[PDB]
């Protein structure tokens, strides 16, 4: 059952770029400049040629304290060390 349309990018677009290979945010830009999905520069395949590759999960890391009813903590972040390796993606907000 349909419930909603969001006429914008979403937080979770990341996980879609990962399984399809298509840079959604570049696509947005290309589109608005005036191009067409399949123009060789924009490189979006035809619907038939768009496929799922693997599976992806997104976790949003926030200062919501679970030991305090998920109230957002504040302050200076003295240490911030993210992570890496194969199959890992990081999109940083105000965590540096």
């Amino acid at each position: 059952y349909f419930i909603e349309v969001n006429p914008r990018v979403q937080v979770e677009h990341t996980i879609t770029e990962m399984i399809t290979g298509i840079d959604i945010v570049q696509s947005q830009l290309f589109i608005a400049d005036g191009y067409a999905l399949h123009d060789q520069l924009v490189a979006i395949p035809k619907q038939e040629d768009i496929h799922i590759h693997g599976s992806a999960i997104q976790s949003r890391i926030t200062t919501e304290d679970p030991l305090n009813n998920f109230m957002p903590d504040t302050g200076r972040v003295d240490t911030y060390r993210s992570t890496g390796g194969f199959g890992v993606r990081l999109d940083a907000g105000n965590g540096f």
């Binding site: 914008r8 840079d23 940083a92 105000n94």
Partner: protein, 96 residues
């Protein structure tokens, strides 16, 4: 590489602001960030080629909703286009 869009002003903050900036630089497009007073130190401000204060005097959230100030800055700086991101003004009729 781009037809009309030579410069994009990213009318948001945080994670999505950085994402857009990164997509712009990949396409050789100049980027313009906006920050509220409160966000004078947000790291998305250090990811753009230009940055300008917005909402001077408004409350924290209202400052990123100041449509006319955003348009002033867009115009002042030579921004062909605005990416509104998600949240804030991204779904706002008056702003589009």
């Amino acid at each position: 590489m781009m037809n009309r869009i030579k410069k994009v002003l990213v009318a948001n903050r945080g994670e999505i602001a950085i994402r857009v900036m990164r997509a712009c630089t990949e396409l050789k497009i100049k980027t313009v960030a906006i920050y509220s007073q409160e966000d004078t130190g947000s790291f998305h401000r250090y990811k753009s080629d230009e940055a300008y204060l917005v909402g001077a005097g408004k409350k924290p959230i209202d400052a990123y909703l100041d449509i006319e100030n955003i348009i002033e800055i867009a115009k002042e700086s030579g921004a062909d286009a605005i990416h509104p991101g998600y949240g804030f003004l991204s779904e706002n009729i008056e702003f589009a």
